[PDB]
Design a protein around this ligand. Structure first.
Ligand SMILES: [Ca+2]
Length: 742
């Protein structure tokens, strides 16, 4: 548990002892007390009677004589009396995690009222032993050790190839910590497993075991929890939502001493074995999750997939009451929670087993059906991709040949491998999409025909088409938004996470009908054999992906007519179409800019912008004011540079903010022109200072998209809205700076 294990040898074989606090005598693993003769026989309430012995053993090299009983466990429960010299000391591993930055981060983003928010800040301390304090820290689970030695024909040992030495230092720490905790034991074995290193965003590296050779031997003989699909159907979305990431829980379940040889691996010419369940093993996710489910059975609403846990209660007070009940269970069992990726008491959770963020109160996940806009292609190869993409809608769209005709005429126009794109063509393309958004082309779902799903993906997002098996029109298209982590995935994994998000909505439309999925992938079996270093997603992703093949209701077919969508341009995402109230934003930024006639005839101009930071959470208040002269520039430039300053100051505040411009051109450009100027490369603006200002705004929004931009004329507004009052102050500051000369 929280006490550091102590190295000890009893009968030649090394073992570990744990300082106990109970007054009961020392327990010893059962396999050593068979040969020994019993002194007497006593019964224990917490009544079964067991034999009593008196054996000698070494603790840290010093022999110890004590009256002992048996223990079904693999550790030596050490009575404090028998060892008066040795004192209890807490566990001390290598690296201490930044636990205070984690808790302050969770307290910041919590959507709970300040009343319950202080209860949580108190719950950090009462259950301090529950959170993960050390890196690679694991907990002990007082459970009957698992037997994973199923199957009479053992697998063949794999030779260990040299690995990257740049990863050895960061991994040897983990080897030391697990050895220190007894998670790893030095022991030769018949089986050997390859080990692979993969980098971590912080610069260090984590090791990966290749257990697919042992999994082909071990048969599937365990009760599987509801899979990704079955869990997501029974969920209950209430007011607040909370997710708790465990610290590799399979490292908490110990395996039987007989099964240690199976999990063996070679590190630095030395062979080690696993005391606990290892990650990448066949039955580790199932054996671990089942235990977790029983504990969470008592809670009214819960869902557990792998490490992640889900809790959603509508009552603010009851969410915290159940949350404390969750913590006691996890602390009493010996589980360890990582506050690095945990999310507590938020209106939406970023990840709940599935990659989709969960908002609202809906038992079934909802997502936008309609396809999204596409940025103009920069090259011919990116324009040929989108044409062969729309080729499917020829057989059921009347105006198709008429609305696509202009784009065909544009390709042969230049004939110089460079293509010129007109702004109206961008609007024409937007019309092509709106035709698909119209429910005419949308066929109706038929409960008789099976559900056909055609899946392809672009570097920016995926494209999913739900069909009827005979129908020429699709029931409904589906376009999934890639998260910042999924964009890092390889192209093959972008398809798989796309299919994952597509089979979710298919369950709603299945209605007891088998589902056939067509995909550019030729063989599903070959995909499981895809090499490991090419997978750039978490194993939780692949397990979640592979668990869907086993369903006989779903079948996957290779489709040749699916085109290549690697050169598909970026999907146009609009953060301005949703409008949010100014009170819910954490920060409000009013901007403005003026430019009177310069006194000097040479400059001929003078500018001055104004910035106001306002917060509406408690009442209408202003944090700071700013009034800056900009020299000879455009009045709109003063209104252009006014938001570049405001965009930066929002980065220091992690939360929803809103910037407001008196200018029409600024807000409209940030909504439609900015997604263009990014891909446009700022071509044919405007000399160089003008372009640098727009890029800086684009990059600032790239680092934090939580920034929304509105626009309000505010011409002689007596008291139109409570919002225009703050903008009247910003225009005052912009005017003051415009009147000041250097
Ligand atoms: Ca202005």
């Amino acid at each position: 548990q929280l006490l550091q294990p102590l190295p000890a040898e009893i009968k030649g074989t090394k073992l570990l002892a744990h300082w106990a606090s109970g007054a009961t005598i020392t327990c010893i693993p059962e396999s050593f007390l068979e040969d020994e003769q019993p002194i007497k026989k006593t019964l224990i309430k917490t009544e079964k009677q067991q034999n009593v012995y008196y054996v000698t053993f070494k603790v840290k090299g010093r022999k110890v004589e004590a009256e002992v009983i048996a223990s079904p466990y693999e550790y030596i429960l050490l009575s404090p009396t028998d060892v008066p010299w040795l004192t209890q000391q807490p566990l001390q591993l290598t690296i201490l995690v930044p636990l205070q930055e984690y808790q302050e981060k969770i307290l910041s983003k919590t959507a709970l009222p300040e009343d319950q928010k202080q209860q949580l800040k108190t719950l950090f301390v009462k259950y301090d032993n529950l959170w993960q304090h050390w890196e690679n820290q694991v907990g002990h689970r007082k459970i009957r050790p698992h037997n994973i030695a199923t199957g009479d024909y053992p697998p063949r040992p794999q030779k260990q190839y040299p690995i990257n030495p740049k990863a050895k230092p960061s991994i040897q720490i983990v080897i030391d910590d697990l050895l220190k905790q007894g998670v790893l034991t030095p022991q030769n074995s018949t089986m050997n497993t390859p080990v692979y290193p993969v980098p971590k965003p912080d610069g260090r590296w984590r090791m990966v075991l290749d257990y697919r050779e042992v999994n082909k031997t071990i048969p599937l003989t365990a009760a599987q929890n509801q899979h990704s699909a079955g869990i997501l159907a029974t969920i209950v979305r209430q007011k607040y939502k909370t997710t708790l990431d465990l610290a590799n829980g399979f490292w908490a379940h110990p395996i039987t001493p007989e099964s240690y040889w199976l999990t063996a691996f070679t590190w630095q010419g030395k062979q080690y074995c696993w005391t606990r369940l290892p990650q990448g093993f066949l039955n580790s996710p199932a054996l671990f999750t089942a235990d977790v489910v029983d504990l969470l059975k008592e809670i009214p609403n819960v869902q557990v997939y792998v490490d992640d846990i889900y809790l959603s209660h509508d009552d603010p007070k009851e969410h915290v009451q159940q949350l404390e009940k969750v913590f006691q269970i996890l602390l009493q069992a010996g589980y360890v929670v990582s506050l690095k990726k945990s999310e507590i008491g938020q209106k939406t959770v970023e990840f709940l087993g599935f990659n989709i963020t969960k908002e609202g109160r809906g038992l079934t996940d909802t997502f936008k059906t309609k396809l999204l806009n596409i940025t103009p292609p920069k090259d011919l190869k990116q324009l040929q991709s989108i044409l062969g993409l729309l080729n499917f809608a020829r057989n059921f769209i009347p105006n198709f040949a008429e609305l696509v005709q202009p784009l065909y005429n544009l390709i042969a126009s230049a004939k110089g491998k460079y293509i010129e794109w007109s702004e109206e063509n961008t609007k024409q393309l937007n019309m092509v999409i709106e035709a698909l958004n119209t429910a005419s082309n949308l066929e109706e779902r038929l409960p008789e025909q099976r559900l056909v799903i055609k899946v392809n993906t672009s570097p920016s997002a995926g494209y999913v088409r739900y069909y009827n098996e005979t129908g020429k029109k699709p029931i409904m298209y589906l376009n999934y938004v890639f998260s910042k982590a999924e964009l890092k995935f390889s192209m093959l994994e972008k398809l798989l996470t796309t299919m994952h998000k597509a089979l979710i909505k298919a369950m709603d439309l299945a209605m007891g009908q088998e589902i056939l999925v067509y995909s550019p992938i030729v063989s599903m079996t070959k995909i499981q054999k895809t090499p490991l270093p090419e997978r750039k997603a978490l194993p939780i992703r692949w397990i979640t992906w592979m668990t869907y093949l086993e369903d006989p209701r779903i079948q996957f077919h290779y489709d040749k007519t699916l085109p290549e969508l690697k050169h598909i341009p970026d999907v146009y995402t609009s953060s301005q179409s949703p409008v949010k109230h100014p009170s819910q934003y954490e920060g409000v930024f009013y901007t403005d800019g003026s430019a009177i006639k310069s006194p000097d005839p040479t400059k001929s101009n003078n500018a001055g912008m104004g910035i106001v930071h306002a917060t509406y959470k408690p009442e209408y208040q202003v944090l700071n004011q700013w009034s800056i002269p900009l020299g000879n520039h455009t009045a709109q430039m003063a209104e252009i540079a006014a938001v570049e300053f405001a965009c930066k100051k929002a980065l220091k505040i992690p939360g929803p903010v809103l910037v407001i411009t008196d200018s029409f051109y600024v807000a409209e450009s940030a909504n439609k022109e900015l997604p263009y100027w990014k891909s446009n490369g700022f071509v044919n603006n405007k000399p160089l200072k003008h372009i640098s200002k727009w890029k800086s705004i684009a990059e600032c929004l790239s680092m934090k998209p939580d920034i929304t931009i509105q626009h309000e004329k505010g011409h002689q507004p007596t008291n139109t809205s409570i919002h225009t009052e703050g903008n009247a102050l910003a225009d005052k500051l912009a005017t003051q700076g415009s009147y000041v000369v250097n």
